[PDB]
RNA sequence: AAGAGUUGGAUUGUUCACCCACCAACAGGGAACGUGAGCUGGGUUUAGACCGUCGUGAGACAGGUUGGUUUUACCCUCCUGCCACAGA
RNA sequence: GGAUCAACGAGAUUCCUGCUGUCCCUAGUCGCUGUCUGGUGAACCAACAACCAAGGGAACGGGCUUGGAUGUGUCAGCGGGGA
RNA sequence: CGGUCUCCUCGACUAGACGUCGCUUGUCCACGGACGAAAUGCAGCUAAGGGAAGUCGGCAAACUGGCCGUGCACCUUUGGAAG
RNA sequence: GGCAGCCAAGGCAGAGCAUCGUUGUGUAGAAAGGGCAUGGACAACAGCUGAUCGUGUUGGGAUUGAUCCCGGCUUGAGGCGUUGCCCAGAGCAGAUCUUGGUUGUAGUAGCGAGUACUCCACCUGGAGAGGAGUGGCACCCCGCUGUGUGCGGUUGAGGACUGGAGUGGA
RNA sequence: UUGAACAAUGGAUCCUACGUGGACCAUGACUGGUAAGCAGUGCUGGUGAUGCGGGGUGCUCCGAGAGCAGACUUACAGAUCCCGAG
RNA sequence: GGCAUAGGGGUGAAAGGCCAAUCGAGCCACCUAGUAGCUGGUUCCCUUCGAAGUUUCCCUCAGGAUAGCUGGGAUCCAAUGAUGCAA
RNA sequence: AGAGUGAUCGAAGGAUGCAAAGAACUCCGCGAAGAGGGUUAAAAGUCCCUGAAGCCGCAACAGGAUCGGUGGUGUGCAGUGCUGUAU
C-alpha cells in the first residue's frame, strides 16, 4: 500500500558509498578541456585552509536590490605557498583511456619531496632519487632524460606537471610535502612540454595560476565526524518521544518484499571525511606573503597597515605567512587541510560568475572570543594605559 | 601414563613439562600457545614479558569471535588480539618448569626452541548462576591441561 | 514522457468522508490490504462495570459506554559503515 | 428508582488561560551503559544450511529449473528476511 | 535493589520526625581499569522564533509553589466554594 | 532323485541333478516363501582360551542384503564360540520419546541502583614487578635495556558517605 | 461342414487373515453457478501406489512402463550454442 | 502475638476474589497403567503376490459393521515338446 | 541425601592389585604439580577392570570462491594396502 502523504527522499544516492575516503588529499578526476588554441597554463593548485573571516565589498549586479550596496561576505582564508615543480608525466591515448607513458623528474629534488617515499624518514637511509640525480648528471642518464622528454613530445596526448605543495612553510607539525600533478592545458603538446620543462624546480606562485576575481572548484576531503546515526548522517526526522528503545532511528528499514534491506535505506555509519568537490567558488582576493608585504590585508578604507592574521592568530592554526587566497564562502574540510583548487568546470555566465570583486574591508579581529578591535594598536588606543603596559 | 603427543628423535635433546587442571580459561591458553609454538625459548619469554606489559598482543585466531581489533596484531597478519594475563602467567610457569627440566637434563635452555606446546580442555567444574523468572543456569570453569617440549637447536 | 514533485490543518480510532487554506499540483495505486523482536495501542477482541433491547434464568447482542500486562536478537543473511589476509 | 443537585473524585469527556522540544526541527551538554579491556562468564535457539530474479510447485523457496552475481575471514551496529 | 516485630534517638536552617548539611557511632562494600568516552540507549538538563500547528487524546515536561498584608466571584445543603 | 553304458558330479525326495520355457514396478496389506541377528534351557562340536577370552578400535576379504570371517593394536578372562532344537522382556533414526554425557552459540550477552576513592608503610614464595633481558665478565662487578595506572589485608595521612524514622545501640 | 470367427494352463468346489471404506485428475456426456485450481455427477484411463524419455521446471500431459549388464534399434520429441543429433 | 472458620467447604464493604508463587472448586496419596471412534511413534534382509476411497445399515458424516477389491491355504479334475548318426 | 508448613515426595551411587607392594630418593618450584627414579606381570595410582560413540587439542599430510554442495556415476591423479603371478 502506498504511503499516504508523499515526501522527497533523504540524502543523495550519487554520493552513495558514504565511507571514510582512502586518501587525505583531494583527487582531481577531471581536468578542464584542453583547447590547444589557448596558451599553455596550469589548471589547479594546492591551498591549505587557514581559517575563515568576513570581508566588506560593494555588489555589482544590475537588477538586484543590493546592487551598488556594500554587503558583508564570509570568506575562507586559504594559505597557498608556491608549489615546487618536480617532474613531468606524459599520457598516451589508448583505447582503454589514458596510459601514463613516461615520468621525467627534475635534477635536484627537495628532501621534503623525498619524504613522500618513506613512512618513516629518520630511520631510513634517505636514498630517494639518489641514483636518479647522479645518473642525470651522468651523460648516459642525460640520454634517458632527453629520450623520455622526446617520448612525451611525440606520443603523449596529455601532459601533466608534478608539483609539491610545501606543507612545511605553514609551520604545522608536518615536514613532508603534498605531491600532485596538474594538467598544462592549451598549446601544442611540444609547447606544453617545454612550458613544463621551463618550470623544473621553479617554485611557482598561486597568482600566476589564478586571477583575483575568478571562479574555481574546491576539491578535497570534508570534516570527519565519525560513526553517526540516521538523524544526522542522513537527516531523517526522529520518532515521537513515546517510542520504545529508541527515537533517533529509522522505523521501517524495508518492506517485507524484497526480503532484504536495500542500499537506498538510511543506515547509521561513517559521517564526514568524504571526498567532495565544492564548485563555483569565487576568488575575492589574492594577497602576497606577509613576510614581504606586512600590509597585505589593507584595503581602500584602512589607515593602518595590517596582515590577514587576526588578533591572537587563527584559532588552532597560527599566523598566515604565505600567499593567501580569499575564497568566497566555505570550502570542505577543517583548517590545516589540503584543498586542491581547480579551474571551474560547471561554468555559468551570470554576473555572479563573471563579476569583478574588490574587497573594501577585511575583518582581522580576534576569532578566539569576540574581538571588538581590528588592530592591536586600535586595542591600545581604546584600552590605553593598563597596569601591565605601565609596568613595561 | 606421562604420555605426550610428540615423538622426538632424541629425547636426550629435549625438555618436557606438563600441567593438569590448571584453572585457566582454555580458549585463551590455546591462542597463547599457538602463538608461542615455534618460537625459541628466549623469543618466547621475551614475547610473554611484552604481552604482559601490553606492548604486543596475542592474536585470537580461532577462539576470538567478538575480540577487539588491535594494531599489535599486525605482527601475525591478523587484527583481533588480546592480552590474556592469567594464561600468559600460567604458560610462563609451564615454560619455566620445562627450562628447569632442561637444566636438570644438562641442556642449554637458551639453545632450545619450543617444539610441541599444547593445551587440552580439562574437566569442567560447575557452579550455579541465577537467572530471571526463577531459573538456574551453570557456570562451568573450562580449565586446561598444558604440555610443552623444548627441543635443542639443530645447526 | 513515470525524472522531480504531490502540502499545512479542524472533526473522527478511523481507511474513507467533509470542510478551512496554501500551491505549479495538492493524481490514483502496490510492496504478506509493505512496515508492532520499528513505535503507538485510539480501535476491534478476554477477565471488571453501566445502560438499552432480548431471555423465567444464567446470560446474548455488526446496539451504545468506560477501564484494561503488546515479551526476546548476542545466531545467519541483507543493509550500514570497518578491517585484514589473499594464503586455497 | 425518575429529575434537579452543594461538596468531594488518581472517574469519562469539552473549552479558555498560562506554560512549555509535543511539534516546525532539531541541536548541545552531562552521569551510567555500550564502545576497548584484566578477571569471570551463561542462556535462547539449532534438520542441514545461510547471495538474488523469475518460473513451476501444497498456489509467498536457502536448496528445485533457467538465469544473474559471488575471494576467504572480521568489528560495531541493524531490525527487511529466516512465513 | 523484594519482604520481615518492637524500643532509644544529637546540632544548624526550618512549622517540622519534611528536606539539606554536620559532632557521636559505623562504613568506603557493592567486579574493576584505560580511552573524553562512536552510534543507540536509560537518566539529568537546557534551547532562539512560534506556542498543541504534534498526538486517539496537552501523553510527557514545563508554568505555579513557603510566609506576610490587602482581598476574593458564580453557585450553595448556608457548612462551603476558598489557598 | 541307482532298478543307470563307464568315470566326474549329484546323492537332505518341498532337497539335489540336467535341459528347456515364462515372468521381473509397487503404497496399504500378505506369504503354511527363504534367510541374517540377540538372551538363555536341553543336546552335539573329546570346539576355542594365560602360546591371551570377550569388549573395543583400525585395515582386509566375503555377501544382493540382513550380516559373516580374518590381520594389527587395546585388553587380559570375575572367559568365549559353531550346529540342532526349545523358551523369549529378542533388531530403532524419529515417538515436543526416557536416562546420561556433550556441542555450536561463545570467550559472546553480560557481571552498570545504594556518590569514592587516593598516598606512604608493613604483612609476601613473588607484588616498586624480567627467566637464565643484554654487552663487557669470567659468579662478583661495571654498563645498557624492559616493567601492565598494578592481587589481598591492615596501621597511619587525606577525601567522602551513613546523618538519630541511621549503615548506630538492644 | 465336428455345421461362425478369435483367443484361452483352464473349469468346478470351498475355506480363510488382513488393508481399504477422506479420494483426486483428464475429456461437447453433463447439472448448479457470471465464473472458479468452485460444487456434484457419467464412461474410461490415470494419479494415489509410478520410477524412466520429452514438455526448462511441474504427483495427473505426450511416449513408455521399471531385476543386473552388453550390443543394436527406436517411441514421444528433437538438432544455432547451452545440449546428443543438419 | 494468641485462637477460631477447611474444600462443593471456608471467607469475602462481592473482584467467582481469597484459602502457602495453586482456585468458576486448594493440595496430597490411592482407585489409575481411568477412558479416548483422536494426535504421535511402532526396531532386520531378500523374494513373490498386491489394493480401496465404492454398496447397505448405524445418534451414522474423523468411526464402525456389511458386500466389493487385496493375500494365503487348499479340494475335484484337466493341461503339460525335445533319440546326430552307427550298433 | 534432598524437597514441601504439612499430608507426603524421594534420588544418584558396584569392580586397584595376587599381594598396599598405595609411589622411597633426586631436580625445580611457595606449593600443587612436572621431569627423573621406583613398586608391579602391568600402573591397574585410592578419579583406580575395560574404556565406545559424540566433542575437543596437537602433529603430519590433502585440499579449500560458487547447492558448481552431501550422495551417486564413469575415468583420472596422488597416497595406501590386498590377491595372483609364465619362462
Amino acid at each position: 500500500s502506498h504511503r499516504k502523504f508523499e515526501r522527497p527522499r533523504h540524502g543523495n544516492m550519487g554520493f552513495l558509498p558514504r565511507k571514510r575516503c582512502r586518501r587525505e588529499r583531494g583527487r582531481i578526476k577531471t581536468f578542464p578541456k584542453d583547447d590547444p588554441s589557448q596558451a599553455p597554463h596550469l589548471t589547479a593548485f594546492l591551498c591549505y585552509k587557514a581559517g575563515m573571516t568576513h570581508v566588506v565589498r560593494e555588489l555589482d549586479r544590475p537588477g538586484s536590490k543590493m546592487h551598488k550596496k556594500e554587503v558583508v561576505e564570509a570568506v575562507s582564508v586559504m594559505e597557498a605557498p608556491p608549489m615546487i615543480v618536480v617532474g613531468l608525466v606524459g599520457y598516451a591515448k589508448t583505447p582503454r583511456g589514458l596510459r601514463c607513458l613516461k615520468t621525467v623528474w627534475a635534477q635536484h629534488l627537495p628532501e621534503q619531496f623525498k619524504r613522500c617515499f618513506y613512512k618513516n624518514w629518520s630511520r631510513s637511509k634517505k636514498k630517494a632519487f639518489s641514483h636518479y640525480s647522479a645518473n642525470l648528471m651522468g651523460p648516459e642518464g642525460k640520454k634517458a632524460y632527453e629520450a623520455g622528454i622526446a617520448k612525451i613530445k611525440k606520443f603523449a596526448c596529455v601532459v601533466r606537471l608534478i608539483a609539491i605543495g610545501q606543507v612545511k612553510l605553514l609551520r604545522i607539525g608536518q615536514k613532508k610535502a603534498h605531491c600532485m600533478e596538474i594538467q598544462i592545458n592549451g598549446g601544442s603538446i611540444a609547447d606544453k612540454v617545454e612550458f613544463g620543462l621551463k618550470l623544473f624546480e621553479s617554485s611557482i606562485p598561486v597568482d600566476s595560476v589564478f586571477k583575483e576575481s575568478e571562479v574555481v572548484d574546491c576539491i578535497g576531503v570534508t570534516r570527519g565526524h565519525g560513526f553517526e546515526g540516521v538523524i544526522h548522517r542522513w537527516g531523517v526526522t526522529r520518532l515521537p518521544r513515546k517510542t520504545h528503545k529508541g527515537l533517533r532511528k529509522v522505523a521501517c528499514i524495508g518492506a517485507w518484499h524484497p526480503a532484504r534491506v536495500g542500499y537506498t535505506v538510511p543506515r547509521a555509519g561513517q559521517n564526514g571525511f568524504h571526498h567532495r568537490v565544492e564548485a563555483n567558488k569565487k576568488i575575492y582576493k589574492i594577497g602576497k606573503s606577509a613576510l614581504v608585504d606586512k600590509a597585505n590585508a589593507r584595503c581602500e578604507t584602512d589607515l593602518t597597515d595590517k596582515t590577514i592574521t587576526p588578533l591572537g592568530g587563527f584559532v588552532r592554526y597560527g599566523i598566515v605567512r604565505e600567499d593567501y587566497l580569499l575564497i568566497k564562502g566555505s570550502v570542505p574540510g577543517p583548517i590545516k587541510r589540503v584543498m586542491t583548487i581547480r579551474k571551474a568546470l560547471r561554468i555559468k555566465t551570470n554576473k555572479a560568475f563573471t563579476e569583478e570583486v574588490q574587497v573594501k574591508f577585511i575583518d582581522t579581529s580576534s576569532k578566539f572570543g569576540h574581538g571588538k578591535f581590528q588592530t592591536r594598536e586600535e586595542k591600545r588606543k581604546f584600552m590605553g594605559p593598563t597596569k601591565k603596559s605601565a609596568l613595561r | 601414563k606421562a604420555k605426550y603427543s610428540y615423538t622426538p628423535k632424541a629425547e636426550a635433546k629435549c625438555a618436557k613439562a606438563r600441567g593438569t587442571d590448571l584453572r585457566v580459561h582454555f580458549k585463551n591458553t590455546r591462542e597463547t600457545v599457538k602463538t608461542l609454538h615455534g618460537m625459541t625459548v628466549k623469543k618466547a619469554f621475551a614475547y610473554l614479558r611484552d604481552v604482559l606489559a601490553r606492548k604486543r598482543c596475542i592474536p585470537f585466531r580461532r577462539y576470538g569471535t567478538g575480540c577487539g581489533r588491535t594494531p599489535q596484531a599486525k605482527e601475525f597478519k591478523h587484527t583481533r588480539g588480546r592480552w590474556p594475563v592469567k594464561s600468559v602467567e600460567y604458560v610462563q610457569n609451564l615454560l619455566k618448569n620445562a627450562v628447569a627440566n632442561a637444566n636438570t637434563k644438562g641442556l642449554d635452555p637458551n639453545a632450545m626452541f619450543i617444539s610441541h606446546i599444547q593445551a587440552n580442555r580439562a574437566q569442567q567444574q560447575r557452579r550455579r548462576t541465577y537467572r530471571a523468572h526463577g531459573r538456574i543456569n551453570p557456570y562451568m570453569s573450562n580449565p586446561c591441561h598444558l604440555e610443552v617440549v623444548l627441543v635443542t637447536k639443530e645447526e
Side-chain angles (χ1 to χ4, degrees):
Chain A
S1 178
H2 64 278
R3 53 185 303 185
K4 270 59 206 170
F5 297 90
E6 309 277 348
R7 196 180 167 159
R9 189 246 194 277
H10 268 309
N12 204 333
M13 302 283 92
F15 302 102
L16 177 67
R18 272 192 101 193
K19 57 190 284 177
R20 207 190 36 81
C21 71
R22 293 304 109 208
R23 207 181 50 206
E24 204 200 275
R25 199 181 96 245
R27 166 186 187 183
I28 302 190
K29 317 178 186 192
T30 303
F31 280 97
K33 295 275 151 295
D34 205 338
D35 187 27
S37 177
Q38 275 284 51
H41 62 274
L42 292 205
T43 48
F45 211 82
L46 286 173
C47 45
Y48 301 87
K49 199 178 165 170
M52 183 146 199
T53 177
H54 68 268
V55 298
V56 162
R57 59 163 291 262
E58 184 180 1
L59 190 80
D60 192 69
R61 192 168 301 166
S64 158
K65 277 71 179 173
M66 292 312 287
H67 174 52
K68 296 167 169 299
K69 305 297 180 46
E70 309 83 29
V71 304
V72 167
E73 299 271 359
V75 288
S76 300
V77 185
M78 308 296 286
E79 180 179 7
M83 283 180 91
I84 305 177
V85 163
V86 284
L88 288 155
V89 287
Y91 289 89
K93 202 195 61 206
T94 65
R96 304 293 175 94
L98 299 165
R99 204 189 50 84
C100 178
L101 190 52
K102 171 74 179 174
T103 301
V104 187
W105 293 113
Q107 164 79 61
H108 296 324
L109 299 168
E111 68 277 11
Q112 57 164 335
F113 172 58
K114 296 170 178 176
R115 274 196 187 251
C116 301
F117 303 104
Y118 289 112
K119 301 301 111 184
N120 216 30
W121 167 267
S122 296
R123 278 181 166 171
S124 298
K125 308 277 168 171
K126 279 86 78 173
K127 278 174 163 187
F129 296 102
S130 298
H131 298 89
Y132 187 92
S133 287
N135 291 321
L136 215 49
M137 286 293 175
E140 57 272 6
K142 276 194 186 321
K143 301 310 288 181
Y145 172 87
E146 297 187 344
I149 286 164
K151 172 170 302 323
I152 295 182
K153 264 180 303 172
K154 186 183 188 298
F155 314 107
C157 70
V158 162
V159 61
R160 307 220 185 120
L161 199 65
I162 295 181
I164 78 175
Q166 280 187 306
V167 186
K168 63 168 172 47
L169 298 191
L170 318 183
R171 313 261 182 198
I172 63 181
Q174 172 167 189
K175 310 193 193 67
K176 207 186 286 210
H178 294 148
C179 181
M180 70 163 291
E181 78 185 27
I182 316 175
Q183 277 195 0
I184 309 152
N185 288 120
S188 156
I189 294 297
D191 202 342
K192 282 168 161 96
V193 169
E194 290 186 358
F195 166 87
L197 282 178
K198 177 182 302 308
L199 318 163
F200 269 7
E201 313 152 299
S202 194
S203 190
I204 59 172
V206 68
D207 60 345
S208 65
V209 188
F210 299 113
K211 276 320 165 207
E212 205 161 346
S213 83
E214 89 169 20
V215 165
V216 290
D217 296 6
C218 295
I219 311 103
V221 191
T222 76
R223 299 202 65 118
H225 297 300
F227 205 96
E228 285 290 333
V230 290
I231 309 291
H232 200 83
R233 207 217 185 184
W234 290 107
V236 310
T237 180
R238 49 186 211 74
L239 281 307
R241 172 210 74 81
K242 213 171 197 194
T243 46
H244 177 33
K245 77 222 171 187
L247 287 69
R248 302 189 63 87
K249 294 184 150 201
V250 159
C252 186
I253 69 172
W256 189 322
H257 276 98
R260 298 158 315 280
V261 184
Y263 73 104
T264 55
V265 180
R267 313 308 298 264
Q270 157 74 24
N271 191 9
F273 205 73
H274 314 298
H275 181 270
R276 298 280 176 268
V277 181
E278 279 300 325
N280 289 339
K281 301 292 176 173
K282 185 75 82 76
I283 288 183
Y284 276 27
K285 190 176 197 282
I286 288 177
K288 284 308 146 290
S289 158
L291 280 70
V292 182
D293 212 335
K294 289 201 170 202
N296 54 34
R298 175 182 185 161
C299 302
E300 294 293 331
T301 64
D302 275 290
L303 322 171
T304 294
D305 295 280
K306 59 154 166 202
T307 59
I308 193 170
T309 176
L311 265 47
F314 278 99
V315 177
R316 289 200 311 291
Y317 183 77
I319 320 298
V320 159
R321 57 175 79 259
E322 282 299 311
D323 316 319
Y324 71 87
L325 264 52
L326 254 49
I327 302 295
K328 187 214 178 188
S330 63
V331 309
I335 60 185
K336 278 184 283 301
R337 169 77 50 88
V338 55
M339 208 57 44
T340 299
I341 38 171
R342 197 202 49 235
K343 294 196 141 36
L345 256 52
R346 185 181 293 237
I347 293 182
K348 312 200 193 193
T349 312
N350 322 324
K351 202 157 307 278
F353 206 91
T354 80
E355 173 183 318
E356 284 193 350
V357 170
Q358 184 79 51
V359 179
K360 316 279 196 307
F361 167 78
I362 300 188
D363 177 280
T364 62
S365 85
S366 178
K367 313 302 175 312
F368 182 78
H370 295 290
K372 284 79 187 173
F373 314 90
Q374 298 298 319
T375 298
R376 300 182 47 181
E377 289 315 300
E378 179 196 348
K379 179 172 159 166
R380 280 170 164 107
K381 198 197 185 68
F382 198 101
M383 294 175 69
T386 64
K387 220 177 75 166
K388 56 162 56 69
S389 284
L391 275 173
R392 162 183 280 94
Chain B
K1 283 295 187 308
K3 54 178 78 72
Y4 299 178
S5 64
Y6 171 80
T7 79
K9 289 159 49 70
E11 65 271 15
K13 305 196 171 192
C14 290
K16 313 184 312 174
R18 169 186 281 265
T20 49
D21 307 330
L22 283 203
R23 265 43 161 173
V24 223
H25 282 193
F26 167 75
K27 292 195 172 184
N28 307 331
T29 308
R30 186 265 161 189
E31 316 281 340
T32 306
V33 306
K34 182 78 180 205
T35 312
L36 278 175
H37 181 88
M39 308 175 65
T40 59
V41 162
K42 178 166 166 289
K43 274 187 202 71
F45 277 112
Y47 175 56
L48 294 193
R49 270 179 255 123
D50 292 323
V51 173
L52 274 189
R54 271 80 146 165
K55 300 175 70 165
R56 73 176 97 171
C57 80
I58 291 185
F60 273 25
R61 304 158 163 106
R62 169 191 317 213
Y63 294 127
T65 286
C67 168
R69 296 167 174 164
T70 321
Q72 293 162 24
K74 290 174 175 158
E75 199 165 285
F76 319 94
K77 313 306 166 197
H78 212 262
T79 46
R80 308 178 315 197
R82 261 184 205 180
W83 305 262
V85 166
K86 191 180 280 180
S87 47
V88 159
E89 295 280 19
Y90 267 89
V91 181
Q92 274 188 350
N93 295 332
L94 183 76
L95 302 182
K96 285 179 200 147
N97 179 236
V99 162
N101 289 334
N103 272 325
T104 304
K105 272 190 160 196
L107 266 170
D108 178 10
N110 276 268
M112 325 195 78
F113 69 101
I114 298 187
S115 160
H116 177 81
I117 190 146
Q118 191 206 340
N120 282 274
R121 323 206 184 222
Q123 177 187 55
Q124 292 141 20
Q125 304 309 140
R126 297 181 187 89
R127 289 191 306 182
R128 279 196 188 87
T129 200
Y130 289 109
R131 311 316 300 269
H133 303 288
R135 304 186 211 156
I136 306 184
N137 287 171
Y139 272 4
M140 288 187 269
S141 162
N142 287 286
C144 46
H145 323 283
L146 276 172
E147 60 192 42
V148 67
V149 177
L150 321 185
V151 178
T152 202
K153 199 55 57 171
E154 285 303 325
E155 87 266 351

